[PDB]
Amino acid sequence: FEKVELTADGGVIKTILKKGDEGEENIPKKGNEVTVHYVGKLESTGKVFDSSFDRNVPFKFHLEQGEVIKGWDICVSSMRKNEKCLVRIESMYGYGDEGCGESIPGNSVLLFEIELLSFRELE
Numbered sequence: 298f299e300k301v302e303l304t305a306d307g308g309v310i311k312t313i314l315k316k317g318d319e320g321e322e323n324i325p326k327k328g329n330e331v332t333v334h335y336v337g338k339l340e341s342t343g344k345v346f347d348s349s350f351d352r353n354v355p356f357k358f359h360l361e362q363g364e365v366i367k368g369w370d371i372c373v374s375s376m377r378k379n380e381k382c383l384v385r386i387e388s389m390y391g392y393g394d395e396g397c398g399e400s401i402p403g404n405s406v407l408l409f410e411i412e413l414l415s416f417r418e419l420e
């Protein structure tokens with residue numbers, strides 16, 4: 298077991314559910330295209346609001362390019378290939394006071410289960 302606080306203020310806490318592959322080559326780097334599966338829920342209601350499994354299409358994004366909420370860049374950059382984790386993301390590292398669409402209210406704490414399937418360096 299291993300629970301990790303990724304930010305001094307505790308706005309991002311990652312609980313490892315399954316350790317990944319050993320090796321620095323198994324750690325995604327900034328700018329890399331990352332591929333994951335995820336399940337997201339609101340801590341307030343505990344109900345799942347979205348998941349890549351609804352469509353069965355892994356989610357791909359580029360690490361630390363401002364493409365995803367800050368909490369995600371922080372959490373994924375600390376994961377190893379094939380790692381499964383649960384991450385608690387407070388509004389500050391989520392959608393803040395603005396919220397997102399009508400699915401995520403402002404000042405919402407978010408809970409995500411993320412599985413790092415793979416990643417690749419570009420150029």
Ligand SMILES: C=CC[C@@H]1/C=C(\C)C[C@H](C)C[C@H](OC)[C@H]2O[C@@](O)(C(=O)C(=O)N3CCCC[C@H]3C(=O)O[C@H](/C(C)=C/[C@@H]3CC[C@@H](O)[C@H](OC)C3)[C@H](C)[C@@H](O)CC1=O)[C@H](C)C[C@@H]2OC
Binds near residue numbers: 366392400401
């Ligand atoms: C506009 C084009 C649609 C385009 C949608 C897709 C490619 C499909 C892709 C599976 C997203 C899902 O589509 C069903 C769906 O995923 C959510 O349900 C969700 O679980 C979530 O929170 N995610 C998705 C997984 C990564 C973390 C976070 C996110 O970062 O999402 C990202 C996000 C909004 C980042 C902003 C970027 C600007 C920052 O300023 C802001 O921060 C202030 C954060 C998404 C991926 C955007 O980069 C791209 C898009 O939005 C959102 C609740 C609503 C979102 O649909 C909209």
